[PDB]
UniProtKB/Swiss-Prot annotation:
O2 binds at H64. Its EC number is 1.7.-.-, 1.11.1.-. The lineage of its organism: Eukaryota, Metazoa, Chordata, Craniata, Vertebrata. Nitrite binds at H64. Coiled coil: none annotated. GO terms for biological process: removal of superoxide radicals. InterPro entries: Globin (IPR000971), Globin-like_sf (IPR009050), Myoglobin (IPR002335). Keywords: Cytoplasm, Heme, Iron, Metal-binding, Muscle protein, Oxidoreductase, Oxygen transport, Phosphoprotein, Transport. Changing G121A: In metmyoglobin. It is found in: Cytoplasm, Sarcoplasm. The gene is MB. The keyword Transport applies. This is Myoglobin.
Length: 153
């Protein structure tokens, strides 16, 4: 469970994310795709990208980074009271995109990595711990819905 203070550490770094949503999204997705190349196979509009220059230049990759973070910011601002936001997301991720829980872990690691690289002044152990707990909660609740829907991924 996060304290209210921990939720505010999460929202304070998220306000900095929102000052450059596209830049943070490209950094997060490039980190993920280079760390875990198979994850890129899920994107038919841009699965052929190979170099960092091609990734940075892609409009589809930039737009998907913004989609991810628009949705994740909305979830985080609910401070855990997020079933409404999670419901449509678990729905597409279990029945259409088929995104394994291990992939949700991989992008959570990428988010933490980029936030820490871009905001070391204040993304310290407490804020990193709070973000870790909020993403763990996110993954916990998506997984519970996956299993309700019968997706074992
Ligand atoms: C905090 C993480 C995270 C969030 C909140 C997120 C949101 C998110 N992913 C989306 C699409 C999608 N999401 C994925 C893939 C993924 N989705 C994943 O969670 C992971 C790890 C992958 C990839 C390995 C794909 C393939 C689409 C469709 C992209 C498209 O057709 O344009 C959409 C569009 C609407 C929908 O299909 O439901 C949203 C809002 N994606 C995320 O990554």
């Amino acid at each position: 469970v996060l304290s209210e203070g921990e939720w505010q550490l999460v929202l304070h770094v998220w306000a900095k994310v929102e000052a450059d949503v596209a830049g943070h999204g490209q950094d997060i997705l490039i980190r993920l795709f280079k760390s875990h190349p198979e994850t890129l196979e899920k994107f038919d509009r841009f699965k052929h990208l190979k170099t960092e220059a091609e990734m940075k230049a892609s409009e589809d990759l930039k737009k998907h980074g913004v989609t991810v973070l628009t949705a994740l910011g909305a979830i985080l601002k609910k401070k855990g009271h997020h079933e409404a936001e999670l419901k449509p997301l678990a729905q597409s991720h279990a029945t259409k995109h088929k995104i394994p829980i291990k992939y949700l872990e991989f992008i959570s690691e990428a988010i933490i990595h980029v936030l820490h690289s871009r905001h070391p002044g204040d993304f310290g152990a407490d804020a990193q711990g709070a973000m870790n707990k909020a993403l763990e909660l996110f993954r916990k609740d998506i997984a519970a819905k996956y299993k309700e829907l019968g997706y074992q991924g």
